[PDB]
Amino acid sequence: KTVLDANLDPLKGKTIGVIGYGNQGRVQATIMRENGLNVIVGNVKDKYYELAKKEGFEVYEIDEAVRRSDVALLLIPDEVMKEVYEKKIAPVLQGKKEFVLDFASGYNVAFGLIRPPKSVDTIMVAPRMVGEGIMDLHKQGKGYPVLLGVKQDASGKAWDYAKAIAKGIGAIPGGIAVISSFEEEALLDLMSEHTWVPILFGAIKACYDIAVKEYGVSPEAALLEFYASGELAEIARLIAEEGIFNQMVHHSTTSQYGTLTRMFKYYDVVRRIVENEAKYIWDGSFAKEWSLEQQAGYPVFYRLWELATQSEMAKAEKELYKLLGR
Amino acid sequence: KTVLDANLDPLKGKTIGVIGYGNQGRVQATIMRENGLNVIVGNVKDKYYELAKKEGFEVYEIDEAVRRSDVALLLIPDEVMKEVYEKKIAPVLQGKKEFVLDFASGYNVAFGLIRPPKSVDTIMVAPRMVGEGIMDLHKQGKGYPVLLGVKQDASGKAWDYAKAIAKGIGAIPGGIAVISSFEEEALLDLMSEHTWVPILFGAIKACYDIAVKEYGVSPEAALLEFYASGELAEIARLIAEEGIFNQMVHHSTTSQYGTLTRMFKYYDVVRRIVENEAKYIWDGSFAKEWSLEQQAGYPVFYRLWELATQSEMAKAEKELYKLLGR
Amino acid sequence: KTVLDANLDPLKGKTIGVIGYGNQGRVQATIMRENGLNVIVGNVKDKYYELAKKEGFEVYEIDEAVRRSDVALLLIPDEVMKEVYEKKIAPVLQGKKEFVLDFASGYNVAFGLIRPPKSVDTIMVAPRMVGEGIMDLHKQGKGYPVLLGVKQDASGKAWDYAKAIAKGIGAIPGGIAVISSFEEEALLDLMSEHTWVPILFGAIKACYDIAVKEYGVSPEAALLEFYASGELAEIARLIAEEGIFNQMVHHSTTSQYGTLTRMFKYYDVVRRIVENEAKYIWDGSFAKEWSLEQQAGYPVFYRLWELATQSEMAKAEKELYKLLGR
Amino acid sequence: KTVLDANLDPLKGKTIGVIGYGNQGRVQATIMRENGLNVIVGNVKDKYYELAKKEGFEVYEIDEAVRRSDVALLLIPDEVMKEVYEKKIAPVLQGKKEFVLDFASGYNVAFGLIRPPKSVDTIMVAPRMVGEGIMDLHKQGKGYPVLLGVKQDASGKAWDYAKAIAKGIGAIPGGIAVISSFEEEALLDLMSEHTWVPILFGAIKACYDIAVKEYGVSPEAALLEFYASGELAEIARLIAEEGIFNQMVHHSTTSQYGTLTRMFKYYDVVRRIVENEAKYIWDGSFAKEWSLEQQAGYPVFYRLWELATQSEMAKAEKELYKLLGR
Ligand SMILES: [Mg+2]
Ligand SMILES: [Mg+2]
Ligand SMILES: [Mg+2]
Ligand SMILES: [Mg+2]
Ligand SMILES: [Mg+2]
Ligand SMILES: [Mg+2]
Ligand SMILES: [Mg+2]
Ligand SMILES: [Mg+2]
């Protein structure tokens, strides 16, 4: 139920606009120039203004490139986007007869922090890669999977454009493209950062605090078996090629037994962590308190860095990295 | 312990100001002109500026009409009021020797979002009607009940003015006027919207989700017995004339039994919903998080509309209304 | 999955019987006479015997009209029906070769208090209206939705008759007709009276008892904001035309926020009230204790009227209605 | 707030009717004859018909004496009363222009098992005595306290009659008369039999079952210290003259200490027994299941006699009473 190839002639001929030359602009713009598209980099004058000029692009101010644009691509970070949509693009969108605007981030649109007008058809292309492996896969030849999705279709030409950009940026063919929504992309981007990542760090921290403080393990020997040596980077490489359970036939017989007997044991415990976290994002509740942490000036984001950089596990790895040569 | 008639000569002679020509300005201003009062409509130039000019009123800017005013009436909505009191009226209140200012909304004043000075005696007139039945009752002859209330009396002439406006707008005689506070009007306006309205919609939604998903009722037949036919509008008309329990002698004998045996049964369950909701508003807690939802940009107000307009009950009534001719 | 028109010739030609000239007999009989049907009113000699004679009908005793009937319609109340089916119709149903009998009330049949024989095909027509709006909609031209349903089909001609009466009484065309069962009509008639009606009265009663007894609101001011003024009749009229949530765009922004944040909050609390009430009726448990309250002589129905007519909220609205002129 | 004397001329001159010559008819009728009142005993022909004839009264059938009556007194038991009101008095009450009817039992009227018409003014006189001490106090000279109470006053002459009968039966002067309701007399008659009487028997039974079955007391020695000797009849005589706590100064110092330290200790435990029993009667719930026990044929009243007459405490006192000579 995915799409694999399409027509490039919808976005061809016209001049696509690119906003920001950041971590996607150094990546996605050069591929779109290679497919025969007039791309114009929008960026206010900073350090990133230079590299866009240095690598052969015509570059202008942010609100001026969307004037000369026909297809808009908005590749800027998520926490600065709401005020630059409102102070730069919001005065000029009232002159567009037909317009398409493209976000790589469902967080600002799905929770209604950015509401585009009727005439501006908003869509989404969300790359599933590091970003630092795109140009390698652009060099090698294959693609990379992306999520597509429409929010407002006031012309009927949404999927004429929604697949043509995924053809344009070199995602397909070679990779796939999954039709989805704006709301599902915002959920999977956030629930992966709220359910299985902070559980994982809190479990590696809790295995340090149990073994050192009770069982008398040396503080240098605990880190070498938890993350300071590479088993985490070894338990992660095999999932990308063989599967999640299918890499476990490269282990000892004992290691598969104690894993499988506990993975089905603690599943009901960790389901209630996840299912309470998913409704928390689905209500728009998390988008509110991340919007209030920015207005308060990050007092809770600041203290939790000092409680995490002065942890005993975070102190112990500091001297250990001045011992491995790192 | 209510008041029924008073003297009009306190607000007579001077020129009363009217701020905003909205849902009260199209209503309350024409009645005050009929009682022999110099009323002057304050409204910034918009669509509502036209109808105030179109129906024979002298109209000016918002902060300019309170200059020429002697008695101020502030009939503008509640969420825009704090910044237009602070940017338009707050520069000019420092020129008033004697002044009375009148709010139809206790929410902005009782929680201290609007603090008027000493010399400006603030009072309240709160109409108890639809608003769309005023001019009918103005046509017929009777009145409509209102809530009165003083907050700051720095002259002694508060109830000389607090009853004269209720005499002026045609509330009394014909209706009554209840002396109250600013804090009690803010409580009854909000606890009716927080206790028995969202319980009622959540109970009609829960009867759909029980009958369809379990007992195999047709999705078109469930709505015709819950709200799509008129029993709710039939169970509501008889309370306005006969009483809350006194309309139940127009029902079957079985319908009174199953109601009364359950109304006294679930009373202790729904008391704890109400009594926890009333202290939540009495602490000023709700006024805080409604003030933070506006600054965050309504992310939780936005998501809960999409969860309520994509409900299965809200989808099922859409096709049903393209079936009754509605 | 509803039916909109059918054939009238099944019930045409023969003489349909009508039992009782009550709240449906003054309504449903005159429409059936207008469609070219020989209707004969059955009623024992009382006050309702007169108006059936007064408005041009041939009228007889109850058990005698079903002798001359070919199609039976039984429009009598629910609490008297079991003994008049058993003492008047039960001697004479043993002479019918072919017969159809029609109840407007699923409560007596679905719980097995009335068990008709094999040869008597029992069906249901259940009007979804006030009853006092039928003749207006008969005057205007449109119809009104009804529930259909068969219980015993011992001829194959059930839906030949089950739609012909809905065509006969003027329900369709103009309204719809939903095919259902006897058991589903008894459930939706009773669970609306047991779940969201007695919760609603118990919540308006609990908002009086919280505001007056604790927060010091005046007892005359509490009723004017809960039901004595018309917002309940204003919050009910807009649901009949626009929808349940679609009428909330006629409100203030604050009123939609505090409603939607609490309607999704108390939904899990009020689901357990409903889902325990629906299995209580589905077991036939409620039909038992309403049958025992009648045999005990209503001692619990009597006391709960005195506890509800001597409530402080029910006392306070009495003097208030001698103050509005009501 | 009690009444002590009144006028006898309201019930004087006319002929008062007396229904039943039972435990009150052998008592209350002879006193009313002594005050100069035409009393006529109504009783169907049984054993009690004889003693009413034997002691000089004119006696008739039950429904015939209320024909010749002007003031009705209904001194018959409570479980037979509903069907003899309905089959004997209910045909003849439709001939009375003015009538007063008097019950000595609030249980049948307060729960609505007997509903008299408009023209029949129903009142209550409830004697507070054994019944077997009336004629002694009639011999000695003093009176006995009674409860008065009106239910329906459709003439204004209720308390003209409600005190004249208490003057007539020799209650006042010498005793008092307390104005009350029908509902309060039914509550105090039943909650004394449901709260402190069955707790008391269940506590004397539980002290037998603890001492014999565990602590090895002889089964003949346990009864002599609980009820078979007279301390219960000794702890009861002193309350009637001195008070409930004021009789405790006739005891040992130790007996007052262990009583008072435990009476305030178990008060919160036995309050929840009482307060759940009082709402059970106030809802009319007990009147329902006593009405259903009669229709079922007393299966639960029958088994609980056999479980109480075959108790080990009830067996042990049988041989003990063939040992004291009782
Ligand atoms: Mg991600
Ligand atoms: Mg290993
Ligand atoms: Mg309101
Ligand atoms: Mg009904
Ligand atoms: Mg109904
Ligand atoms: Mg409102
Ligand atoms: Mg007693
Ligand atoms: Mg002693």
Say how far apart CA C28 and CA C35 lie, in whole Å: 11
Are C245 and C172 contained in the same domain?
no
Strands (E), chain A: 15-19, 38-42, 59-60, 71-74, 99-103, 120-127, 146-150, 177-180
* Helices within chain B (DSSP H only): 25-34, 47-54, 62-65, 81-84, 107-110, 134-140, 158-162, 164-168, 182-191, 197-211, 219-226, 232-237, 253-263, 267-282, 285-296, 300-309, 312-321
Residue for token pair 């309170």: B66
CA distances from D209 to C274, D201, D270 (A): 46, 12, 21
Residues forming a β-bridge with A149: A124, A180
B196 shares a domain with B173: no
Q: Choose one of A137, A155, A180: the last residue of a domain.
A: A180
- In the numeric block, the tokens 């759940």 are attached to D276
- Which chain C residues are within 8 Å of B235, Cβ to Cβ? 197, 236
Whether D200 and D310 share a structural domain: yes
Comparing CB atoms, the residue among A183, A283, A291 nearest residue B296 is: A291
Mutate which of B192, B306, B317 to test chain C, going by most C C-beta atoms within 10 A?
B192
Q: Which of residues 245-264 of C touch B (CB under 8 A)?
A: 245, 252-264
DSSP assignments along D44-104, one per residue: -SSHHHHHHHHTS--EE-HHHHTTS-SEEEE---SSSHHHHIIIIITTTGGG-SSEEEEES
How many angstroms away from the CA of A20 is the closest CA of chain B? 24
Tokens 């006699």, residue?
A: D305
Identify whether the C-beta of residue A145 lies closer than 8 Å to the C-beta of residue A128. yes
Quote the CA–CA distance of C139 and C27 in Å, as a whole number: 12
Type of residue at B3: V
On whether both A147 and A124 belong to a single domain, the answer is: yes
Portion 106-125 of A in contact with B at CB < 8 A: 111-113
CA distance A206 to chain B (A): 34
Distance set, CA B266 to CA A87, B79, B262, C193, C281 (Å): 53, 36, 6, 13, 17
State the best of C81, C142, C229, C238 to mutate against chain B, taking most chain B CBs within 10 Å: C229
Residue B236 DSSP SS3: helix
Give the separation between CA C41 and CA B75, rounded to whole angstroms.
Answer: 60
- Test C197 with B225 for CB contact under 8 angstroms: no
Cα–chain center distance at A321: 29
> What is the amino acid identity at position D25?
G
Collapsed DSSP state (helix, strand, coil) of residue C73: strand
Cis? peptide before A173, omega within 30° of 0:
yes
- Contacts B311 to A, Cβ<8 Å: none
Q: How many Å apart are CA B243 and CA A144, to the nearest integer?
A: 69
Strand order in the sheet with C15-19: C59-60, C38-42, C15-19, C71-74, C99-103, C120-127, C146-150, C177-180
Q: CA neighbours within 13 Å on the CB side: how many for A18?
A: 26
Name residue, tokens 């169970």.
B235
Which amino acid does the sequence have at C73? L
Among C220, C266, C223, smallest CA distance to B280 is for C266
Are both D81 and D215 inside the same structural domain? no
D157-160's contacts with Cβ under 8 Å and 24+ in sequence apart are D157/D10, D157/D100, D157/D121, D158/D100, D158/D121, D158/D123, D160/D7, D160/D10
Same domain, A130 and A18: yes
Is the sign of the CA dihedral D276, D282, D284, D286 positive or negative?
positive
Tokens representing residue C62 in the block: 């109850």
Contact C162, C150 (CB under 8 A): yes
Among the listed residues C170, C237, C206, C217, the one whose alpha carbon sits nearest the alpha carbon of residue C34: C170
User: Could you identify the residue written with the tokens 């469930």?
Assistant: B222
Contact C154, C97 (CB under 8 A): no
Closest Cα in chain C to B291: C254
Nearest CA in chain C to D289: C296
Distance (Å, whole) CA B127 – CA B242: 22
Collapsing DSSP to helix, strand or coil, D165 comes out as helix
Residues of C in contact with D82 (CB under 8 A): 297
Q: Do chains A and D touch (3 or more CB pairs under 8 A)?
A: no
Instruction: Decide: A129 and A143 in contact? Cβ < 8 Å.
Output: no
CB contact under 8 A, D112 and C293: no
**How far does the CA of residue C309 sit from the closest CA of chain D (Å)?**
14
Contacts of D285 in chain C (CB under 8 A): 300
CA angle A43-A46-A52, nearest 5°? Answer: 55
Taking the C-alpha atoms of residue D77 and residue D86, their distance in angstroms, rounded to an integer, is: 15
B288/B141 same-domain check: no
C-alpha A248 to ligand 2 mean position (Å) = 11
Q: How many contacts, defined by CB atoms under 8 Å, are there between C and D? A: 41
DSSP 8-state code for residue D2: -
Nearest Cα neighbor of B75 from B57, B87, B64, B62 is B62
User: A16 and A161: one domain?
Assistant: yes
Structure tokens at B14: 């001077």
Same domain, A107 and A125: yes
Across A305-314, b (16+ Cβ under 10 Å) vs e yields eeeeeeeebe
Helix axes A197-211, A312-321, angle to 10 degrees: 80
**Residue A291: both structure tokens together:** 């919007």
For residues D19 and D121, give the distance between their C-alpha atoms in angstroms, rounded to a whole number: 17
Chains contacting D (3+ CB pairs below 8 angstroms): C
CA-based nearest distance B310→chain A, Å: 13
**Contact at CB, C209 and B237, closer than 8 angstroms:** no
- Chain B nearest-CA distance from A116, in A, is 14
Q: Pairing mode, if any, of strands C146-150 and C120-127?
A: antiparallel
CATH of the domain at D128: 3.40.50.720
Contact between chains at C211 and B278 (C-beta distance less than 8 A): yes
> Distance, CA C193 to ligand 5 centroid (Å)?
8
The residue from C118, C153, C180 where one domain ends is: C180
Residues in chain B within 8 Å Cβ distance of A282: 303, 307
Quick one: DSSP state of residue B56? Answer: S
Tokens of A187: 């959920």
For helices D197-211 and D219-226, the axis angle rounded to 10 degrees is 150
Could you say which DSSP state residue D173 is in? T
Angstroms from A298 CA to nearest CA on chain B: 15
What is the rounded distance in angstroms from the CA atom of residue D240 to the CA atom of residue C202? Answer: 46
Instruction: Return d(Cα A157, Cα D39) in angstroms, integer.
Output: 103
- What is the enclosing helix (H) or strand (E) of B101? strand B99-103
Residue D73 contacts residue C259 (beta carbons within 8 Å): no
Which residues 209-238 in chain B show a CB within 8 A of chain C?
209-211, 214-218, 220-222, 224-237
Quickly count: other Cβ atoms within 10 Å of residue A296's Cβ: 10
What's chain C's length in residues?
326
Question: Of chain D residues 284-323, which have a CB less than 8 A from chain C?
Answer: 284-285, 287-288, 291-292, 295
Point out the domain boundary residue: C180, C197, C221: C180
Residue found by looking up tokens 């000699």 in the block = C45
The tokens for A4 are 């694999």
Residue C228 token pair: 């004595």
Q: Which residue of A has its CA nearest to B290?
A: A288
Q: Is the peptide bond before B10 cis (omega within 30 degrees of 0)?
A: no
Q: Name the residue with tokens 């992309």.
A: A185
D82 touches chain C (CB under 8 A): yes
- How do B177-180 and B146-150 pair as beta strands? parallel
DSSP C63: H
Residue C41 is classified by DSSP as E
| C6: number of Cβ within 10 Å | 20
Q: How far apart are the first and last CA of chain C?
A: 47
Count CB neighbours of C3 within 10 A: 16
Identify the H or E element spanning D38: strand D38-42
**Collapsed DSSP state (helix, strand, coil) of residue A224:** helix
Which residues in chain B have their CB less than 8 angstroms from residue A112's CB? 297-299, 302-303
Q: Which of B20, B10, B4, B197 is nearest to B104 (CA)?
A: B20
User: Resolution to 1 decimal, in Å?
Assistant: 2.9
C-alpha closest to that of C22 among C55, C47, C59: C47
Distance between CA C108 and CA C100 in Å, rounded? Answer: 17
Residue that is written with structure tokens 């009659």 in the block:
D161
Q: Say yes or no for a CB contact (<8 Å) between A288 and B304.
A: no
Q: CB burial class (10 A; 0-12, 13-18, 19+) of residue D265?
A: exposed
Q: Are D284 and C304 in contact (CB under 8 A)?
A: yes
State the ligand closest to the CA atom of C250. Answer: 6
3-class SS at A65? helix
Does B199 contact C270 at a Cβ distance shorter than 8 Å?
Answer: yes
> Across the interface, which of B202, B234, B237 has its CB nearest the CB of C270?
B202
C263 Cβ neighbours under 8 A, 6+ residues apart: B198, B201, B202, B205, B308
Residue B313 and residue B302: Cα distance in Å, rounded? 19
DSSP states along C48-61:
HHHHHHHTS--EE-
Tokens (6 digits) for D207: 């002290």
Q: Are B226 and C192 a contacting pair at CB < 8 A?
A: yes
| Total of domains in chain B | 2
Residues with Cβ within 8 Å of residue D253, at least 6 apart in sequence: none
Work out the angle at residue C80's Cα, subtended by the Cα atoms of residues C74 and C81, and round it to the nearest 5 degrees: 35
Cα–Cα distance between C107 and C191 in angstroms, integer?
12
Query: Is the sign of the CA dihedral D120, D123, D129, D134 positive or negative?
Result: negative
- List of chain D residues whose C-beta atoms are within 8 Å of the C-beta of residue C292: 288, 292
Contact B295, C299 (CB under 8 A): no
Residues 6+ apart with CB under 8 A from B150: B121, B122, B123, B124, B158, B159, B162
- Domain of residue A305 covers 181-326
B101 strand-pairing partners: B72, B122
Task: Report chain C's C-alpha Rg in angstroms.
Answer: 23
Cα-to-chain-centroid distance, residue A292: 22
- Separation CA D301–CA D306 (nearest Å): 9
Residue A143 identity: G
Same domain, A48 and A190: no
Q: Give residues with Cβ within 8 angstroms of B133, minimum separation 6.
A: B144, C230
State the Cα angle at D65 between D63 and D66, rounded to 5°: 70
CA of A208 to the centre of ligand 1 (A): 27
- A79-90 residues labelled b (16+ CB within 10 A) or e (exposed): eebeebbeebbe
Least CB–CB distance from C145: residue in B78, B224, B244: B224
Q: Which residue in C299, C306, C307 is closest to D113 by CB distance?
A: C299
**Chain D CB contacts of C302 below 8 Å:** 111-112, 284
d(CA B86, CA B66): 13
Q: Give strand pairing partners of B73.
A: B18, B102
**A295 contact residues in B (CB cutoff 8 A):** 295
Q: Which ligand has the shortest distance to the CA of B254?
A: 4
What is the number of the ligand closest to the CA of B196? 3
Please judge whether B130 and C307 are an interchain contact, meaning their C-beta atoms are less than 8 angstroms apart. Answer: no
Cβ contacts of B136 on chain C, cutoff 8 Å? none
Residue B43 CA to residue B29 CA, distance in Å, equals 13
Check: CB of residue C190 under 8 Å from CB of residue C14: no
Q: How far is CA C100 from the centre of its chain?
A: 22
Subunits with at least 3 CB pairs below 8 A relative to chain B?
Answer: A, C
CB contact under 8 A, B147 and C224: yes
Beta strands of chain C (E only): which ranges? 15-19, 38-42, 59-60, 71-74, 99-103, 120-127, 146-150, 177-180
Give the tokens for residue A51: 């590299």
Which is it for strands D15-19 and D71-74: parallel, antiparallel or unpaired? parallel
Asked if residue A199 and residue A149 are part of one domain, the reply reads no
Measured CA to CA, the distance from residue B171 to residue D165 in angstroms comes to 55
Instruction: Give the amino acid at A142.
Output: K
Q: Is A174 exposed, middle or buried (0-12, 13-18, 19+ CB in 10 A)?
A: middle
A167 neighbors A6 (Cβ within 8 angstroms): yes
Give the C-alpha separation, D66 to D93, whole Å: 9
**Contact between residue B178 and residue B40 where contact means Cβ atoms under 8 Å apart:** no
CA–CA distance, C31 with C138 (Å, rounded to integer): 8
In sequence order, what are the residues at sequence separation of 6 or more whose Cβ sits closer than 8 angstroms to the Cβ of residue C34?
C170
Method: cryo-EM
- Which ligand is nearest the CA of A186, by number? 1
Expressed in percent and rounded to 5, the helix, strand and coil fractions of chain A are: 50, 10, 40
CA–CA distance, A93 with B183 (Å, rounded to integer): 45
Three-state secondary structure call for residue D186: helix
Instruction: Identify residue B95 by its one-letter amino acid code.
Output: G
**Are D93 and D99 a contacting pair, CB within 8 Å?**
yes
* Measured CA angle at D277 (ends D273, D283), to 5 deg: 155
C partners (3+ CB pairs within 8 A) are: B, D
Residues in chain B: 326
Which residues of chain B does A288 touch, with a Cβ-Cβ cutoff of 8 Å?
292-293, 296, 299-300
Q: Does D165 share its domain with D209?
A: no
